[PDB]
DNA sequence: CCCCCCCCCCACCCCCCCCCCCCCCCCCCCCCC
DNA sequence: GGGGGGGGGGGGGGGGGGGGGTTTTTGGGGGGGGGG
C-alpha cells in the first residue's frame, strides 16, 4: 500500500467547572486549561497550518 | 533480463502500488513508462458503444480547431484501467504531466507536425465525479484534484508569465539550465551549479518562453452560502488556453488542483505557520452547445407547418392560457435582426415586452421562466434595481487607486435578456436609466473623467401592475399606468393581463393548476436513467417539444439565422401603421410611434427565426401584424374596443 | 448593499430563509418599504442590481404580519379591503387574513 | 555515478513486482518463479552491497517496500497454511520460499554498524538506512500481532523435531539464522544524528535529534511492543524450551538475544519497591517544593520596577546590581554578581555497539505497562530458573578460548549479560526468600572469575575504556554476589586471596583515571570502590595497606567530579559517596586531603535551598557530614592560618613541609 | 558578434542605397527630403523590404529588438553619406515602419506575440507628458574618475556594477552635460468598440513612442499601430510581467489638431476638391442631404445641424472681451422623432465629438474633474466630455434626465467657452470650445 | 401620506549581521632528569 | 615518577562583505426630514 499517514488525535475536553469571561483573562493562566465564553464577531478562512 | 531504460510492468503491478506515496510511485521510471503506455492505450482503444474511438474523434477535432486543449472525460478513465483514474485523483500534478506528453504523442501520431502548431497539449479533465464547496475545502484536499463551484468575483488582466526560464550567473560560465516556473513561487537559486556558490542572478537573454496567466477570485455563490454566514473565497489561477473563459459575475464550476505555499505575509499577520492556498485550474465550466445530430434535430423539427405554434405552446408550458404573453415572450426571446445601414444608421433588433396586469396572473413566473430559458439572462425586481446597477457604474478601484467602470445588468446581459419584475415599483430616477440601452442599445457613461460608450444589446421584458394595484377597462392605458410615453413607446409589445371571473375559464385553469401541482410533486436500465425517462414522460404531457431541445433551438436560431425581408406587403404594413397612428390619436391610448412600425418588422423576423428561415414569408408578417394590432386593440377601453377591433379586422382576420 | 468593495448585507427576510419572519406594526410600514418584499413573498427570492453587485438571493420564508386597522379601530361595517392600507398585489400574496 | 544507481533501483523495483501480490478472487499470492526471484534478490545483496560495500540495494529494497508488502505476507500466510494444517495432518515447495523469506529478513534487519573501515557510501547512507530498519521493526511486531514471529518459530521447530544427532550443518545454520532474526528484531534502535563539523555552529544549534520516519512513533519501537508481540507469539516459550534443550553451536546468538533484551532495562523497575495517581500527587508535591524555592528567587513586582542595590564591599569600593529581592539578601546579590560574568572557561570533548546502561542517562527508565512487566519478569524468572547456569557455562567454556579474537562488541555484550542477571537474581532473592542465590551459581565457578578478570585486565592494559567499564560493572556484581554468599554460608576465601596484589592495584587505579570519563564511567568506578571496600572489610592482605592505595587526590577528584552531578544523581549514590567520605575523613582521618574549595562550594550548592530535598536521607547525611567537616576545618585553621591559603590549592607534595601541612604537629 | 552586426548594417545600407521602383530611389530621396526639413527619421514600407531581400525581413521579424537598432544605424550612415561631404553632425535616425500585415485585435495579443512585430488598431484614450530617455550616457567612476560612455537603444539597460579598471561597491554616476536624451511618450490604446466581445468591458494597452512619433495623436482619435509587443518588469503574482507595445509606427484614419492649433495638413488634390466643392451652387442642399440620410424629413433640423457642425466665427476685441463662435442646438420633443439617431449621426460625422447620455453624466464627468495622482499623493485635473469635445461637438442625449446641478455645470463652458475650476488648491480656467 | 431632496458615510550612508580566517591558548603525550 | 616542551586541536576575535531602511473630491447607496 501507499503509507496511509499517522493519525493525529485531538483531545477535546469539555464540561469544565466554571466559565471565564473575556475580561477575566489574566496571564498566570497562560498554559492552563480554561473555558471561555463570548459572541463570535468575525471568523477567518479555514487554512492549512504546517504541523509536522 | 531487460534493458533498464525500457523495463515496464503489467496493469496488476500498477494496482500493486509499493512506493511510500502515490507521487513516488508515479515518478518511478518503470512505472512512469508503463503509465505512458497505459494512457496511450486508453486514448487509442477506448470507444463509444458505436465502436468509434472517442479520443480519436476528439483529437481530430482538436487539430481542426488548432486547440492546445484535449477534453478528457474522467468517467471514461474510471470505466477502463481505473487505477489510472485513482492516480489522477490522488496525484494530478505528476499524472497530468505524463498524460499531457501522452496526449501530445497521440495527436502527433494523428496529425504529424502538430508540434509546429503547438509544442504541448494539456489534457482538460472533465466529469470528475466528486464536488466541494469553497466552505468545504480542507487540509486533506491539498495537492488533490478537486471540483468546485462559485461566482467569479474579480478577474485580473491577462499577462505573460515565464514558463521555461534559463538564468545567468554573473560569475563563471553564466548560463544555467531551464527551470520550469510554477503558479506559486519564484525560482530560487540557492547556489550556481557551475561554480557551486551563491551569487546574483538574472533571467537569461538567449532564450526564454512565456505562457498566458490570469488570476480569478472565486467566491461562494450568494444562494449557496447559508444565510448569516459570510461568503468564502479562493484565488483561482488560469494558464495558457484558460484565460478569459469567464467574466465577472458569472457562476462557474472549476476543476483544478488545490495547492498551497509558504507566504510570509500570512504567517506575519496571523502568527502561525499557516500557508496561502489556490486552485490551479485545469477546466472551467459556465449547456447551450449542440452535436451534429442535435443540429439535424433542429433542422428536422423546423420543417413542421405548426412549428411557430408548437414553440409558442412550449413557452412556459406549466402556465395555463396567456397565449398572447407566450407569443410576446417567444418573439422577444428569438428577437429580430439588428441592422446597420452602410454603417451610417444602426437599428435595434431586440424586441421589448411589457407584461402589465392584475395580481396573481403568472407575470413574475413568466419572467422567471425566461431567466431559465435564455442563453444570457439577468433578473432584477423593482426597488432592487438602481440606475447605475442597471446600466453601468464607476468605482474607485481598490488595488489600482483609479476610476474604472463596472457593467450593470444591461452590460451583463448584452446579447441576451434583462428581466425587470415589478417594474412599476422602481423609483423613476432608476427607471429612466433604461432609455439609452433600451433603444440605442448602448450605455454612455461620462463620470470621474471616464468617457466611453458600452454595448447593451438587450431585449428587456418587464412586468408591472396598473395604478392602484388592478386594471380598469373603463380607463385608457395612460390612465391605467403611471409610465410616460417615451418609456411606453420603447416597450414595443404590450400585453395587458386582466384577472376576470369567468366560470368555465376558471374551471379549466383550476383543473390545470391542480394537475400541475400533482404533476410537480417530488415523489411523482438504471434508476437515474429511469427517473430521467419519467421526467420526459411527465414533460411531454404539456410541452410539444422538449425544453432541453427548446433552449438549444433558441440559441441556434439566435446565432445562425438572420431573416431577410422580401416580397414585402409594403402597402399592407403602411396601411396598418397609418390606421394605428390615426386611431392612436385618442389621448390616453398606447402611443403608436415609428419604433412600433419597426417593431412589426422585428416581430416578423423573429417568427421567420422560429422557422430557421432566412426569408420572412407572408405568414410571418401576417402573424406579426396580428400580434401588434391585437396588442394595440387590447389596450383600449371597452367604450371603443369593439368598434376599433371591427375596423382593424380587415388587416388581421384575413389571416 | 454595503462596502465590506461592494457586497450584500442580509436583511430580515434573508435571515428567515427556510423559516418564519414576523413583522409587527406592518401597516405603519411605508409603501416604499412594503413593495420591496413582493418578490420574497411569492417568488421566494430577492433579486438585486446595484453598485456593480448583481445577485438573486433565497428568501424561502413564511411571513407573519400583525397589521393594525387604519385608525386603530376595526370598522366592522367596511370590507377587509377598506380596513387596511394594503391593496390587491400584497393581499393576494397572503394565504389568509 | 548515479546512472548506476537509477539502473539499480529500476532493477529492484521490477524484482519487487516479480515477488507476488494480492489476488482479488484479499489474500496474498506468490509470483511465478517466486523462489528464483527471492534467490536473485539475495544475490543482489551479496553481489552488490556486500562485495562492493555499498548498501544501495538495502536502500532500494526499502524504497520499493518488498519486506512490508511481500515477505511478511508470504511468511504469515505460510504460517497460516502450516498452523491450520497442523490440526488436520505443495507444502514441500512453499517451505523453501518461507525459508528464503526469513533469510531475506535476516539480511534486511542485519544490525548496521559504521566505522572508519566503512565505505564513503556506507557512512553517507547510514542515517537514512537506519530509519527503514525501524519501519521494519514496527511492521514485524505489529502485523497480525506479529504472526511472522510464529512463522519463525515454526521454521525452527522443523529442525528441533529431528534429533541432536539428526541435525545437519544446514539445519544447525537454520536454527542459528532464526536466532539472528529474533536478535535483529530486538536490536533495531533509532540512529544518532551524525552532524558534519567542518563548518562552525550557527547562532542556534541543532533543532532536534529525532530520527524516526513519519509513520513511526517511539512507542511502536518501545519494549512494550516487543514483549507484547513476543508473548502473543510465545517467543518466550520458544526461547525457554530451547535453553532447556541445551545438552552448543547456537550458544553465542542465544546469549546475544538475552543481552539485547537486558541491555537498557533497570532491574528495580520490575519490582514495586489509585497508586499511580497517588504517586503522581507525590511528584506534584516534589516539584511544588521547587516552586516555593524559585518564588523566593523571583521579583515581587514587575521586571521594569528596577530598584538598584549597591554592595559596598568590606573595602572602600562599590558594586551595583538590579536584583529587587537581592536588596534584602546579600547571598542573592553575591551569586548574581557571580552569574553576571560573560566569561566561561573553555571545555573539552569526550561506533560499533548499541546504547545501553553503559552509556544512557543515569535515570533513563523503561516504562513498562503492567502486563508487559509481568510477562517480561516471569520470562526472565523462568530463564534464571532454567537457562542461566548452563548458558553461562556454555559461552564461558567457549570464551576462555579465543580471547585474542573476541571482538569488542562480543566482549562488552558478554560482560553486561553476566552482570545484569547476577544483579537481578540478587534483587529478586532479597525480595523473595523463595528465590535462590545458587540459581546463578555458575557466576562463582572460578573459570568465570578468571575470564572476567582476564577481560578487565586486558581491556585496561589495552586502554579499551568500553570493555574496561563493562568489566568494572561485572566486577561490581561479582563482588556483590560474593558478599551475599559470604553471608549465606569456601570460594569467598579463594577469590579473597586471588584478588590480592595486582588486582588490588588495578582496581585502585580505575578511579584514578575515571575522572576523565563520562558520568556512568565514574559511577561504575564509585560503585566498584564501595563494593570492594565493603568486601575487604567483611574479610577483615592488611586493610590499611589496601585502602591507602585508594585514598589519594586523583581518586578524590573522581569522587568530587561525580558528586558535581548531585541534582541528577540518585539519593543512594550520594549516600555511597558520603559513606566513602565518612570512612576517609572521619575514620581514616586523612582530613587534610578534603580541605579544598571545590568541595566547599559543592557542599553549599547542595545544602542551599536550591539543592537537595529537605526530607532526603542523603540531605541528612550531607548535613551530618558538613557539621563535623566545618568543625574540623575550623580547628585546622585556628591551628594554621597558612591553611587559609592552602585551602585554595592542591596540598604540598614536597613532604618536608607536606607532613606539617597534613598534620600540623 | 559585431562582425555579423556589421554585415546586417551593410545589408540595410544596401537596401537604402539600392532600392528603386520606376526609376526613383525612394528611400534615398525620402531620407534626403527628411534631412532638409530636419526630421531625422525614415518611414520604411515593409512590403518594399520583403520585396528587396526577404532574408532581411526574416532577420528583422525573427528578432526586431536587436535588428531595428542596426537598421537605424544603417540609416545614420547613409544620411551622412548623402548629406555631408566625405573629407572636406546628425542624431541616430528613428526607423518608422509602414505595414499591411494582418492585424491582431488588442484582446488576442498574448504570450506568443512577445518580441514579435505586431499590427493592431484602437482608440487612444490618454496621452502622457514627454518624459526624457537617454540615447547616450556619459559615465564616470565616483572614485577614480575612469570615464566612459554607454550608447542605449530603447527596445530592452543599466549602469555597470563595478569599475572597468579599489572604487567602492556601486561606483558609476552620469554626466548630464555630455549625455544625450530623447522624448518618450506613453499612450493608452483601448480596443475598437465594435470589436469588444459580448458582455466584456473594453480592454486597453499601455504603449510608448519616442522621437518623431511623440505628440502625433491625441485622445479620442481612432488609430492603427505597428509595434513590438513587449514586456516590462513592474515594481508590483509570481514571474508575471506587464505587457506593452513599443510603437514603431502610427497611422491615424485622419490627422486632426494633434499638436496643431493654427497649423494644418491638407493635400493639394483634396484642397482643390474642397475648393470646387465650395463653389457648387447646390452646396447647402447637398450637405443637408448628407446629414442622417436614412432619417426622413426633419429638414430644418438637418439644416441647423449643418450650421452647428460648421459654427460661426470666434472673435476677440480690443475691449479684451471674447465673442462665442460655436453654436448650441436643443432638440426637444416627442418620442421616436429620431432625436437620438440625429445625435448619433452628428457624433459620427464631426471631426471631434463626444456622445453622452444625461443620466449617464455628472457635473465633473462633463466639464472637468479633480483627481489625486496615487504615488505622487497629489491632486491633478482630468478632462471631462467638454474638454475631450474641445474644438468640436458634445452630443448630450437624454438631456432632460440630467440632474439639475449636473445640468447647471454646463453653463459657463456652454457660453464663455471656459471651465473655471477652483478645487483642492487648483485654480484654472480651462478652455472648452464646444 | 407620498415623493423628492439632501444629508451622511464610506472608499547613499550607516548598523546589524554573518561568515571566514588566523592566531593563540590549552591540553595531552613523550622524553629527560 | 614528575615536570617540561612540543605539537595539534579548538575556540574566539577581528575584519570584511552585504543588505536593508490625511484631506479632498466624486460617486453611490441608504436614511431622514419637509412640503404639497
Ligand atoms: N395561468 C396560470 N397557470 C398557472 N399558475 C398560475 C397562473 N396564473 C397564476 N398562477 C400562479 O400564481 C402564482 C403567482 O404568480 P406570479 O407570477 O407572482 O403572478 P404575477 O402576475 O406576477 N402577480 P403580481 O406579482 O402580484 O403582479 C404562481 O405560483 C403561479 O403558479
Ligand atoms: N423620421 C424617421 N426616419 C427613419 N427612422 C425613424 C424616424 N423617426 C424615428 N425613426 C426610427 O425610430 C427610432 C427613433 O429613435 P430615437 O432616435 O431614440 O428617437 P428619439 O427622438 O430620440 N425618441 P426619444 O429618445 O424617446 O426621445 C429609430 O429606431 C429610428 O430608426
Ligand atoms: Mg409579479
Ligand atoms: Mg432617443
Ligand atoms: Zn556561477
Ligand atoms: Zn573606478
- Can you tell me the distance from the alpha carbon of B73 to that of B57, in angstroms, rounded to the nearest whole number? 13
Same domain, B479 and B539: yes
Ligand 2 probe mutation, B344, B345, B439, most atoms within 8 A of CB = B439
Residue D275 has which C-alpha cell? 497508586
Nearest residue (CA) to ligand 2, atom 4: E295
Nearest residue (CA) to ligand 1, atom 30: B362
- Considering only CB atoms, B449 lies closest to which of E198, E231, E369, namely E369
CATH number where B115 lies: 3.30.1640.10
Residue B487 has which C-alpha cell? 418609456
- Considering only CB atoms, B29 lies closest to which of D10, D17, D69, namely D10
Last residue before each gap in chain C (C to N over 2.5 A): 4
Instruction: Check if the beta carbon of residue D474 is closer than 8 Å to that of residue D524.
Output: no
CATH number where B585 lies: 3.40.50.300
Q: Best residue in B95, B273, B278, B279 to probe A by mutation, most A CBs within 10 Å?
A: B273
Same domain, B423 and B463: yes
Residue B527 inside a domain? The answer is yes
The burial of C42, by beta-carbon neighbours within 10 Å (0-12 exposed, 13-18 middle, 19 or more buried), is given as: middle
- For residue B456, how far is its CA from the centre of ligand 2 (angstroms)? 18
Same domain, B255 and B314: no
Cβ of B360 closer than 6 Å to ligand 1, yes or no, is yes
Same domain, B198 and B327: no
HEC assignment per residue over D488-557: HCCHHHHHHHHCCCHHHHHHHHHHHHHHHCCHHHHHHHHHHHHHHHHHHHHHCCCHHHHHHHHCCHHHHH
Q: Which ligand has an atom closest to residue E294 CA?
A: 2
SS3 B266: helix
Residue B19 inside a domain? The answer is no
Which of B229, B259, B286 terminates a domain? The answer is B286
Residue B140: how many CB atoms within 10 A of its CB?
8
HEC assignment per residue over C29-91: CCHHHHHCCHHHHHCCEEEEEECCEEEEEECCEEEEEECCCCCCCCCCCCCCCCCCCCCHHHH
Protein D557 CA to nucleic acid F24 C1', in Å?
Answer: 29
Tell me the residues surrounding ligand 4 (ion) with CB < 5 Å: E 340
Check whether residue D214 has its CB closer than 7 Å to nucleic acid strand F.
no
Check whether residue C4 has its CB closer than 7 Å to nucleic acid strand F.
yes
CA distances for E72 relative to E44, E66, E96, angstroms: 11, 11, 10
Residue B391 inside a domain? The answer is yes
Residues 6+ apart with CB under 8 A from E388: B451, E219, E220, E354
Amino acid at each position: 500500500s501507499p503509507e496511509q499517514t499517522e493519525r493525529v488525535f485531538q483531545i477535546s475536553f469539555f464540561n469544565l467547572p466554571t466559565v471565564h469571561r473575556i475580561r477575566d483573562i489574566r496571564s498566570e493562566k497562560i498554559g492552563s486549561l480554561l473555558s471561555i465564553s463570548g459572541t463570535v464577531t468575525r471568523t477567518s478562512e479555514v487554512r492549512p497550518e504546517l504541523y509536522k | 533480463d531487460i534493458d533498464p531504460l525500457r523495463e515496464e510492468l503489467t496493469l496488476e503491478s500498477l494496482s500493486n502500488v509499493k512506493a511510500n506515496s502515490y507521487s513516488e510511485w508515479i515518478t518511478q521510471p518503470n512505472v512512469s513508462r508503463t503509465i505512458a503506455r497505459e494512457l496511450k492505450s486508453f486514448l487509442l482503444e477506448y470507444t463509444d458503444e458505436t465502436g468509434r474511438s472517442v479520443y480519436g474523434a476528439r483529437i481530430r477535432t482538436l487539430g481542426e480547431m488548432n486547440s492546445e486543449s484535449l477534453e478528457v472525460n474522467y468517467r471514461h478513465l474510471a470505466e477502463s484501467k481505473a487505477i489510472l483514474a485513482l492516480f489522477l485523483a490522488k496525484c494530478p500534478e505528476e499524472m497530468l504531466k505524463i498524460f499531457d506528453l501522452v496526449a501530445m504523442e497521440a495527436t502527433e501520431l494523428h496529425y504529424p507536425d502538430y508540434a509546429r502548431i503547438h509544442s504541448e497539449i494539456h489534457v482538460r479533465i472533465s466529469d470528475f465525479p466528486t464536488i466541494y464547496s469553497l466552505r468545504e475545502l480542507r487540509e486533506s484536499n491539498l495537492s488533490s484534484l478537486v471540483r468546485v463551484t462559485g461566482v467569479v468575483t474579480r478577474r485580473t488582466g491577462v499577462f505573460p508569465q515565464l514558463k521555461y526560464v534559463k538564468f545567468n550567473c554573473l560569475k563563471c560560465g553564466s548560463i544555467l539550465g531551464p527551470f520550469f516556473q510554477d503558479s506559486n513561487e519564484e525560482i530560487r537559486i540557492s547556489f550556481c551549479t557551475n561554480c557551486k556558490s551563491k551569487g546574483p542572478f538574472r533571467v537569461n537573454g538567449e532564450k526564454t518562453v512565456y505562457r498566458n496567466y490570469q488570476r480569478v477570485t472565486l467566491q461562494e455563490a450568494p444562494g449557496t452560502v447559508p444565510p448569516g454566514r459570510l461568503p468564502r473565497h479562493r484565488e483561482v489561477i488560469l494558464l495558457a488556453d484558460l484565460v478569459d473563459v469567464s467574466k465577472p459575475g458569472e457562476e462557474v464550476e472549476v476543476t483544478g488542483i488545490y495547492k498551497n505555499n509558504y507566504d510570509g505575509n500570512l504567517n506575519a499577520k496571523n502568527g502561525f505557520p499557516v500557508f496561502a492556498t489556490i486552485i490551479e485550474a485545469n477546466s472551467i465550466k459556465r449547456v447551450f452547445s449542440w452535436t451534429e445530430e442535435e443540429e439535424r434535430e433542429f433542422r428536422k423539427i423546423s420543417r413542421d407547418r405548426g412549428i411557430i405554434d408548437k414553440i409558442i405552446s412550449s413557452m412556459a408550458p406549466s402556465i395555463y392560457g396567456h397565449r398572447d404573453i407566450k407569443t410576446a415572450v417567444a418573439c422577444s426571446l428569438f428577437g429580430g435582426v439588428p441592422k446597420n445601414v452602410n454603417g451610417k444608421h444602426s437599428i435595434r433588433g431586440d424586441i421589448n415586452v411589457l407584461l402589465l396586469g392584475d395580481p396573481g396572473t403568472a407575470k413574475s413566473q413568466i419572467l422567471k421562466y425566461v431567466e431559465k430559458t435564455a442563453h444570457r439572462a439577468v433578473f432584477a425586481t423593482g426597488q432592487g434595481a438602481s440606475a447605475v446597477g442597471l446600466t453601468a457604474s464607476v468605482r474607485k478601484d481598490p488595488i489600482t487607486k483609479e476610476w474604472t467602470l463596472e457593467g450593470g445588468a444591461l452590460v451583463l446581459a448584452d446579447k441576451g435578456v434583462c428581466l425587470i419584475d415589478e417594474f412599476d415599483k422602481m423609483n423613476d430616477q432608476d427607471r429612466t436609466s433604461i432609455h439609452e440601452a433600451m433603444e440605442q442599445q448602448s450605455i454612455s457613461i461620462s463620470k470621474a473623467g471616464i468617457v466611453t460608450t458600452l454595448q447593451a444589446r438587450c431585449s428587456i421584458i418587464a412586468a408591472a401592475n396598473p395604478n392602484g394595484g388592478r386594471y380598469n377597462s373603463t380607463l385608457p392605458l395612460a390612465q391605467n399606468v403611471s409610465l410616460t410615453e417615451p418609456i411606453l413607446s420603447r416597450f414595443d409589445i404590450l400585453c395587458v393581463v386582466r384577472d376576470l371571473v369567468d366560470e368555465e375559464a376558471d374551471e379549466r385553469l383550476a383543473t390545470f393548476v391542480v394537475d400541475s401541482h400533482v404533476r410537480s410533486h417530488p415523489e411523482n436500465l438504471n434508476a437515474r436513467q429511469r427517473r430521467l425517462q419519467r421526467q420526459r414522460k411527465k414533460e411531454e404531457e404539456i410541452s410539444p417539444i422538449p425544453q432541453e431541445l427548446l433552449m438549444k433551438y433558441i440559441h441556434y436560431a439566435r446565432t445562425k439565422i438572420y431573416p431577410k425581408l422580401h416580397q414585402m406587403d409594403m402597402d399592407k404594413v403602411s396601411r396598418v401603421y397609418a390606421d394605428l397612428r390615426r386611431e392612436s390619436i385618442s389621448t390616453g391610448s398606447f402611443p403608436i410611434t415609428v419604433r412600433h412600425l419597426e417593431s412589426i418588422l422585428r416581430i416578423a423576423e423573429s417568427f421567420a427565426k422560429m422557422r430557421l428561415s432566412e426569408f420572412v414569408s407572408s405568414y410571418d408578417l401576417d402573424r406579426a401584424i396580428k400580434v401588434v394590432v391585437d396588442s394595440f386593440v387590447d389596450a383600449q377601453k371597452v367604450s371603443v374596443r369593439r368598434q376599433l377591433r371591427r375596423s382593424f379586422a380587415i388587416y388581421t382576420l384575413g389571416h | 448593499v454595503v462596502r465590506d468593495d461592494y457586497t450584500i448585507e442580509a436583511g430580515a427576510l434573508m435571515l428567515a430563509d427556510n423559516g418564519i419572519c414576523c413583522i409587527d406594526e406592518f401597516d405603519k410600514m411605508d409603501i416604499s418599504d412594503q413593495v420591496a418584499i413582493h418578490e420574497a413573498m411569492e417568488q421566494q427570492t430577492i433579486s438585486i442590481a446595484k453598485a456593480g453587485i448583481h445577485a438573486t438571493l433565497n428568501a424561502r420564508t413564511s411571513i407573519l404580519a400583525a397589521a393594525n386597522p387604519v385608525g386603530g379601530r376595526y370598522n366592522r361595517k367596511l370590507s377587509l379591503r377598506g380596513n387596511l392600507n394594503m391593496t390587491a398585489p400584497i393581499m393576494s400574496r397572503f394565504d389568509l387574513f | 555515478a548515479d546512472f548506476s544507481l537509477t539502473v539499480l533501483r529500476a532493477r529492484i523495483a521490477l524484482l519487487a513486482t516479480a515477488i507476488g501480490g494480492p489476488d482479488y478472487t484479499p489474500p496474498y499470492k506468490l509470483g511465478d518463479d517466486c523462489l528464483a526471484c527471492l534467490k536473485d534478490l539475495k544475490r543482489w545483496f551479496k553481489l552488490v552491497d556486500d562485495q562492493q560495500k555499498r548498501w544501495d540495494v538495502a536502500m532500494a529494497v526499502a524504497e520499493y517496500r518488498i519486506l512490508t508488502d511481500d515477505l511478511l505476507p508470504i511468511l504469515i500466510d505460510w504460517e497460516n497454511k502450516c498452523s491450520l494444517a497442523a490440526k488436520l495432518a505443495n507444502k514441500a515447495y512453499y517451505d523453501k520460499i518461507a525459508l528464503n523469506c526469513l533469510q531475506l529478513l535476516v539480511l534486511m534487519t542485519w544490525p548496521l554498524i559504521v566505522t572508519e573501515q566503512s565505505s564513503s557510501n556506507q557512512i553517507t547512507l547510514y542515517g537514512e538506512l537506519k530509519k527503514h530498519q525501524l519501519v521494519y521493526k514496527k511492521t514485524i511486531l505489529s502485523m497480525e500481532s506479529g504472526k511472522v514471529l510464529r512463522a519463525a518459530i515454526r521454521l525452527a521447530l522443523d529442525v528441533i523435531k529431528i534429533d541432536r544427532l539428526s541435525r545437519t550443518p544446514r539445519d544447525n545454520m537454520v536454527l542459528k539464522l532464526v536466532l539472528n532474526f529474533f536478535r535483529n528484531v530486538i536490536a533495531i534502535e533509532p540512529g544518532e544524528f551524525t552532524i558534519n563539523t567542518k563548518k562552525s555552529m550557527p547562532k542556534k544549534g541543532i533543532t532536534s535529534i529525532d530520527t524516526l520516519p513519519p509513520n513511526v512513533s517511539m512507542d511502536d519501537i518501545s519494549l512494550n511492543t516487543v514483549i507484547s508481540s513476543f508473548h502473543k507469539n510465545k517467543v518466550f516459550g520458544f526461547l525457554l524450551t530451547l535453553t532447556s534443550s541445551l545438552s552448543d553451536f547456537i550458544n553465542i546468538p542465544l546469549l546475544e538475544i538475552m543481552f539485547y533484551f537486558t541491555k537498557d532495562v533497570n532491574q528495580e523497575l520490575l519490582f514495586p519497591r489509585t497508586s499511580a495517581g497517588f504517586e503522581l500527587s507525590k511528584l506534584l508535591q516534589k516539584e511544588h517544593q521547587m516552586r516555593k524555592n524559585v518564588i523566593k528567587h523571583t521579583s515581587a513586582r514587575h521586571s521594569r520596577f528596577g530598584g538598584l542595590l549597591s554592595i559596598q564591599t568590606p573595602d572602600k569600593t562599590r558594586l551595583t546590581v538590579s536584583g529587587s529581592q537581592a536588596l534584602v539578601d546579600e547571598k542573592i546579590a553575591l551569586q548574581k554578581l557571580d552569574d553576571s560574568k560573560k566569561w566561561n572557561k573553555r571545555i573539552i570533548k569526550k561506533e560499533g555497539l548499541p546504547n545501553s546502561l553503559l552509556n544512557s542517562q543515569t535515570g533513563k527508565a523503561i516504562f513498562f505497562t503492567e502486563s508487559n512487566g509481568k510477562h517480561f519478569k516471569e520470562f526472565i524468572n523462568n530463564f534464571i530458573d532454567s537457562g542461566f547456569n548452563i548458558l553461562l557455562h556454555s559461552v564461558t567454556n567457549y570464551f576462555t578460548t579465543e580471547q585474542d579474537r573476541m571482538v569488542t562488541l562480543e566482549q562488552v555484550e558478554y560482560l553486561l549479560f553476566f552482570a545484569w542477571f547476577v544483579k537481578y537474581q540478587l534483587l529478586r532473592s532479597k525480595i523473595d526468600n523463595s528465590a535462590d542465590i545458587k540459581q546463578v551459581s555458575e557466576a562463582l565457578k572460578e573459570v568465570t572469575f578468571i575470564l572476567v578478570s582476564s577481560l578487565l585486565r586486558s581491556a585496561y592494559d589495552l586502554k579499551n575504556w568500553t570493555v574496561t567499564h563493562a568489566g568494572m560493572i561485572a566486577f561490581n556484581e561479582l563482588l556483590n554476589l560474593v558478599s551475599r554468599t559470604k553471608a549465606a554460608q569456601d570460594i569467598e576465601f579463594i577469590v579473597s586471596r586471588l584478588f590480592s596484589d595486582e588486582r588490588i592495584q588495578l582496581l585502585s587505579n580505575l578511579p584514578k583515571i575515571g575522572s576523565k570519563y563520562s558520568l556512568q564511567f565514574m559511577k561504575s568506578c564509585i560503585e566498584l570502590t564501595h563494593s570492594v571496600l565493603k568486601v575487604l572489610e567483611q574479610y577483615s592482605v592488611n586493610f590499611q595497606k589496601v585502602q591507602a592505595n585508594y585514598m589519594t587526590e586523583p581518586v578524590i577528584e573522581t569522587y568530587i567530579n561525580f558528586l558535581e552531578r548531585f541534582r541528577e544523581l540518585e539519593d543512594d549514590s550520594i549516600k555511597k559517596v558520603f559513606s566513602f567520605f565518612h570512612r576517609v575523613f572521619v575514620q581514616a582521618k586523612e582530613q587534610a586531603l578534603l580541605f579544598r574549595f571545590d568541595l566547599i562550594i559543592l557542599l553549599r550548592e547542595m545544602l542551599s535551598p536550591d539543592g537537595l530535598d529537605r526530607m532526603s536521607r542523603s540531605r541528612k547525611y550531607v548535613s551530618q557530614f558538613s557539621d563535623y567537616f566545618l568543625a574540623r576545618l575550623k580547628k585546622r585553621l585556628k591551628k594554621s592560618p597558612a591553611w587559609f591559603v592552602g585551602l585554595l590549592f592542591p596540598p604540598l607534595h614536597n613532604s618536608e613541609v607536606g607532613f606539617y601541612q597534613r598534620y600540623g604537629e | 558578434n559585431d562582425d555579423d552586426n556589421t554585415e546586417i548594417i551593410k545589408s540595410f545600407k544596401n537596401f537604402i542605397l539600392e532600392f528603386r521602383l520606376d526609376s526613383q530611389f525612394i528611400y534615398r530621396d525620402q531620407l534626403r527630403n527628411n534631412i532638409l526639413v530636419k526630421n531625422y527619421s525614415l518611414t520604411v514600407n515593409m512590403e518594399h523590404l520583403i520585396g528587396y531581400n526577404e532574408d532581411i525581413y526574416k532577420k528583422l521579424s525573427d528578432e526586431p529588438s536587436d535588428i531595428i537598432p542596426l537598421f537605424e544605424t544603417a540609416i545614420t550612415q547613409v544620411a551622412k553619406r548623402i548629406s555631408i561631404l566625405s573629407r572636406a553632425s546628425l542624431p541616430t535616425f528613428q526607423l518608422i515602419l509602414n505595414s499591411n500585415a494582418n492585424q491582431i485585435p488588442l484582446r488576442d495579443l498574448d504570450s506568443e506575440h512577445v518580441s514579435k512585430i505586431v499590427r493592431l488598431s484602437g482608440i487612444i484614450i490618454s496621452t502622457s507628458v514627454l518624459s526624457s530617455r537617454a540615447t547616450y550616457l556619459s559615465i564616470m567612476c565616483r572614485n577614480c574618475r575612469h570615464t566612459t560612455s554607454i550608447t542605449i537603444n530603447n527596445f530592452n539597460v543599466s549602469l555597470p556594477r563595478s569599475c572597468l579598471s579599489n572604487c567602492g561597491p556601486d561606483p558609476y554616476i552620469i554626466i548630464h552635460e555630455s549625455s544625450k536624451f530623447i522624448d518618450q511618450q506613453f499612450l493608452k490604446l483601448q480596443e475598437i468598440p465594435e470589436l469588444v466581445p459580448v458582455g466584456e468591458m473594453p480592454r486597453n494597452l499601455t504603449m510608448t513612442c519616442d522621437r518623431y512619433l511623440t505628440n502625433k495623436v491625441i485622445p479620442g482619435t481612432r488609430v492603427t499601430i505597428v509595434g513590438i509587443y513587449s514586456i516590462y518588469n513592474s515594481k508590483n503574482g509570481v514571474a508575471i510581467r506587464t505587457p506593452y507595445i513599443k510603437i514603431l509606427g502610427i497611422q491615424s484614419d485622419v490627422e486632426t489638431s494633434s499638436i496643431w492649433n493654427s497649423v494644418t495638413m491638407f493635400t493639394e488634390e483634396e484642397e482643390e476638391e474642397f475648393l470646387q466643392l465650395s463653389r457648387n451652387p447646390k452646396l447647402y442642399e447637398i450637405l443637408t442631404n448628407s446629414i442622417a440620410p436614412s432619417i426622413f424629413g426633419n429638414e430644418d433640423i438637418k439644416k441647423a445641424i449643418v450650421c452647428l457642425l460648421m459654427g460661426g466665427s470666434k472673435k476677440i476685441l480690443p475691449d479684451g472681451m471674447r465673442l462665442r463662435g460655436d453654436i448650441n442646438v436643443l432638440l426637444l420633443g416627442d418620442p421616436g422623432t429620431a432625436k437620438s439617431q440625429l445625435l448619433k449621426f452628428v457624433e459620427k460625422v464631426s471631426p471631434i465629438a463626444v456622445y453622452t447620455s444625461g443620466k449617464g453624466s455628472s457635473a465633473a464627468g462633463l466639464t472637468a474633474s479633480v483627481q489625486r495622482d496615487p504615488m505622487t499623493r497629489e491632486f491633478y485635473l482630468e478632462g471631462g466630455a467638454m474638454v475631450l469635445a474641445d474644438g468640436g461637438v458634445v452630443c448630450i442625449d437624454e438631456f432632460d434626465k440630467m440632474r439639475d446641478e449636473d445640468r447647471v455645470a454646463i453653463h459657463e463652458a456652454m457660453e464663455q467657452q471656459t471651465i473655471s475650476i477652483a478645487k483642492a488648491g487648483i485654480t484654472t480656467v480651462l478652455n472648452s470650445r464646444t
